[PDB]
Amino acid sequence: MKTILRFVAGYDIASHKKKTGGYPWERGKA
Incomplete structure (x- = not known):
């Protein structure tokens, strides 16, 4: 649906890690 999802999907994990x-x-x- 949105390739961008795969990206943001990591942020939510990086916020805790x-x-x-x-x-x-x-x-x-750059």
Whole structure:
């Protein structure tokens, strides 16, 4: 239905696991 789902599906898991970098898609300038 939405390939993007597979992406966000990980965020919900990263929020509990650990967070240290910035953004789920924006790791840096590029």
